Amino acid sequence: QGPSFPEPKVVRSQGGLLSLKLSATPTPLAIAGQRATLLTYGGSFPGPTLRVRPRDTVRLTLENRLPEPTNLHWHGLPISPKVDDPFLEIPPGESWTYEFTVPKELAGTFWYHPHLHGRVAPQLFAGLLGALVVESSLDAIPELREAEEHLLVLKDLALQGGRPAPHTPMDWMNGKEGDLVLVNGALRPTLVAQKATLRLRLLNASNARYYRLALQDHPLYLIAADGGFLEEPLEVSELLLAPGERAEVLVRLRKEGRFLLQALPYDRGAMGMMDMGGMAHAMPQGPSRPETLLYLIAPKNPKPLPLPKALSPFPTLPAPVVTRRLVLTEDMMAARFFINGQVFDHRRVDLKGQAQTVEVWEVENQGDMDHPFHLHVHPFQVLSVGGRPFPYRAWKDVVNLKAGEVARLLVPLREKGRTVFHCHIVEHEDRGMMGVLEVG
C-alpha cells in the first residue's frame, strides 16, 4: 500500500519455526526492461528474505533443480559447520534439509548463497542469493520501532543473450563486475519515504564490486555491522561495503527533496589490459565510475526521530590463547591466489584450534588488490587495521584489507568441526584463496 518499492518477499517464522522448501532453479524474469533467465532461489531475484527471531528453528529444504551440483552457505550465522557444511555437495535433482536453531543473542542481517568450491562465482553471479534477518528486542525501542525499514540488496549483473554473462579470463583475475548495478534486482528504483527516519539494511551480494555509499546531503548513522549491533550509533559521511559485508544505518531526512544514493568512485586495485599507455592512468583499471543506486524522496515536512542513545553493549572477550598469521598473496597473470603460499585443498587442514578459546588472527594482504577476508562459523572482532584502531565494536564476519594492510582479529572459537576461511571476491576463492580451519 501507498508507494511501492521493489524488495524481496519475506518469509517469517511462526510459533518458533521457519519451515520452507526452496528450489534452486533456472528462471525467466523481467530485469531492467528485459527478459533474462537467471538461477534463482524460490523463483525470484533476489531470493526470499527469511525473517526469524532468536531461538527459532530453521528447517530449510534446498531442492536442487540446477544442471550442476550446489550447496548453501549461511553467511555470518554462528551455527554448526555440520549444518553450514562448506564441503557438502547436493547433486542435480536431489534435496537437502538444513536444520538449526538461531542463537539467543544474535541480531542483524545475514544472507545465504552457494558455496560449492569451483562453482561459487558463476552460481552467485547468476542470481543465487537471499537475505536472512534476525529480529532483536532492540527493534522495539521507539527510536527504531518508528523508523521506516527496508532491505537493500546490492548486486550487479551483466547479461549476454538473455542469460548471465560468462566469466572471461580477466574476471577470474579481477572478480566479475557487471554493467547493471541493481538494488533488489531493480535498476535505480525510487523510494518514496513515508517516515522521516529510515532504517536501511544494506547487503553487498556482488561477486566483486565495492560500494562506497553516500547519500546526497545526508550522513548515515551506522547502528549495525555484519554480525550485530554497534554499541551506539556512529555518524559517517560515507560507508564502504565490500563484497559479503552488511550494515544497518539510520537515515534522518531533514528537508523535503529527491536525494541520490550513490556508489562513489572506489579503486580496489583491479588490473586492466594491453600495455600501451600515455599518461592518465595506464593498466591499473583505476577508480570505478560513480553509480546512482536509488532515488530517495523525503516525506513532506519531515521531522526525524532522535537517535537511540545506546544500542547493544559488546561483550568483553577473554585473553587470546594463540596468535596466527595468514598472508594473502596473488599471481595475477595465472589468476591464482594463495594463503601462506598454498592454494585450497579440501583434503588439507591448515589450522587446528580449540573450542572455547579466543585466538588473535593477523591477516596480511601482501597483494596489490583489496581482498575481503571471510571466516565461516566464527564471528570475530576487528581490533585494528594497519596498526590503527577499528572505529567501532561489533561482530564482523568479513573484513576488507587494502594492499599491504594487516588486520588483527579477535576470533572466539565456538562450534567444533571443520570449516573454511576465504576471500569474498568469490572468483579468488574459486581460484585458490581459501583454507581449512578445524576446531576441536
Contacts to Cu ion by CB under 5 A: 75, 244, 371, 423, 425, 428
Candidates 188, 189, 202; CA nearest to 243 is: 202
From start to end of 193-228, where are the E strands? 197-204, 211-215, 220-224
Q: Is 167 annotated as a binding residue?
A: no
Q: Is 117 annotated as a binding residue?
A: no
Nearer to Cu ion, 119 or 371 (CB): 371
Nearer to Cu ion, 195 or 431 (CB): 431
Q: Is 378 annotated as a binding residue?
A: no
Residue 327 identity: V
Nearer to Cu ion, 253 or 335 (CB): 335
Whole-angstrom Cα distance, residue 121 to residue 424?
Answer: 10
Looking at residue 361, what DSSP letter applies?
E
Tell me the closest approach of the beta carbon of residue 265 to Cu ion, in angstroms: 20
Task: Please answer whether residues 63 and 22 qualify as being in contact, where contact means their C-beta atoms are separated by less than 8 angstroms.
Answer: yes
Q: Is 371 annotated as a binding residue?
A: yes
Tell me the closest approach of the beta carbon of residue 297 to Cu ion, in angstroms: 32
Whole-angstrom Cα distance, residue 134 to residue 148?
Answer: 17
Nearer to Cu ion, 209 or 428 (CB): 428
Whole-angstrom Cα distance, residue 216 to residue 222?
Answer: 16
Look at strands 17-31 and 57-64 and give their pairing. parallel
Tell me the closest approach of the beta carbon of residue 252 to Cu ion, in angstroms: 30
Tell me the closest approach of the beta carbon of residue 355 to Cu ion, in angstroms: 23
Pull the grid cell for residue 269: 586495485
Consecutive H or E run containing 145: helix 142-145
Nearer to Cu ion, 148 or 267 (CB): 267
Q: Is 346 annotated as a binding residue?
A: no
Whole-angstrom Cα distance, residue 132 to residue 111?
Answer: 5
Measured in degrees and rounded to the nearest 5, phi and psi for residue 169 equal -60, -35
| Binding residue ranges for Cu(2+) | 73, 75, 113, 115, 281, 371, 374, 376, 422-424, 428
